[PDB]
Design a protein around this ligand. Structure first.
Ligand SMILES: CCCCCCCCO[C@@H]1O[C@H](CO)[C@@H](O)[C@H](O)[C@H]1O
Ligand SMILES: CCCCCCCCO[C@@H]1O[C@H](CO)[C@@H](O)[C@H](O)[C@H]1O
Ligand SMILES: CCCCCCCCO[C@@H]1O[C@H](CO)[C@@H](O)[C@H](O)[C@H]1O
Ligand SMILES: CCCCCCCCO[C@@H]1O[C@H](CO)[C@@H](O)[C@H](O)[C@H]1O
Length: 262
């Protein structure tokens, strides 16, 4: 069953749509691979690597993100016990001198209880209500090991060409690798997307209003085809990646993309 219409940008609703080939996966966040050029390649934190001394400022940045509906209807129609896998990787590709190393990769899996919904906010519609467990770590080992865990809620609301997604979280478990991570990441994430025809303009960021630290990411995409987009990104601030969670930097990159926030 499950009524909720396609609704562009709606993760859960889309997850509720059933496919035939069980190997057809659903997207969660955005999927892209872009060539970037950072302003500061934090080698101080990756000092332990025997190529840090040769870290280049131009890296290949890609993000993979899929959703796996584990059990539709677990809480009534248009609901799903789901999981996702989002992976962001910074790859010193051009630095062949050092044999093209990966400077960092953050793996964050999610197990969540999601709902496709229909709530009128004066023009807007609260489309996704989702809350679940999050884990984010960089798979490294000391001293460059970074990781934390969060319980969270994801809300998605759209109003025509506009889309707003807020994601407040509460930290759980261990945070020794990066004890003060909240000083840099704050207590939530905000996504704003805007549709100008087929052009999609977007913003994703976090800011700890107390410590005044934060980070932002602005982006613009356009169709190259039915499935692939040309994507430009400008990230700036702390938190781009776990290894640089307490490192500030401005990164501009250009590449291709599959899906945008909507
Ligand atoms: C496709 C290349 O795979 C990459 O291999 C790297 C090797 O360490 C990993 O760190 C990255 O996470 C992985 O995406
Ligand atoms: C905070 C937990 C999220 C509540 C989401 C549960 C999904 C229930 O579903 C909601 O039921 C409402 C009826 O009251 C309808 O008006 C909404 O359109 C529908 O999405
Ligand atoms: C040690 C890692 C155990 C991961 O387990 C997590 O623990 C959380 C604690 O609040 C629970 O809320 C999550 O449902 C559970 O997945
Ligand atoms: C940040 C994105 C700014 C979106 O701004 C919008 O641009 C539209 C196109 O010109 C106008 O028609 C709308 O009035 C305006 O709100």
């Amino acid at each position: 069953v499950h009524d909720a219409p396609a609704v562009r940008g709606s993760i859960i609703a889309n997850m509720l749509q059933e496919h035939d080939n069980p190997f057809t996966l659903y997207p969660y966040d955005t999927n892209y691979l872009i060539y970037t050029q950072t302003s500061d390649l934090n080698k101080e934190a990756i000092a332990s690597y025997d190529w840090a001394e040769n870290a280049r400022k131009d890296e290949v940045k890609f993000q993979l993100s899929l959703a796996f509906p584990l059990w539709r209807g677990i809480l009534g129609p248009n609901s799903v016990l789901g999981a996702s896998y989002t992976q962001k990787s910074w790859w010193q590709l051009s630095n062949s001198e050092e044999s093209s190393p990966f400077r960092e990769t953050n793996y964050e899996p999610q197990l969540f209880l999601g709902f496709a919904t229909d709530y009128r906010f004066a023009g807007w519609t609260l489309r996704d209500v989702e809350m679940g467990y999050n884990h984010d770590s960089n798979g490294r080992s000391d001293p460059t090991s970074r990781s934390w865990a969060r319980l969270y809620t994801r809300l998605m609301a759209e109003n025509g060409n506009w889309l707003v997604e807020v994601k407040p979280w509460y930290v759980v478990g261990n945070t020794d690798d990066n004890p003060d991570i909240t000083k840099y990441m704050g207590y939530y994430q905000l996504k704003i997307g805007y549709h100008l025809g087929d052009a999609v303009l977007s913003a994703k960021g976090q800011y700890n209003w107390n410590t005044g630290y934060g980070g932002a990411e602005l982006g613009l995409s356009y169709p190259i085809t039915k499935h692939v987009r040309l994507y430009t990104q400008v990230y700036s601030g702390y938190g781009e990646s776990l290894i640089d969670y307490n490192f500030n930097q401005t990164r501009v990159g250009v590449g291709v993309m599959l899906n945008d926030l909507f």
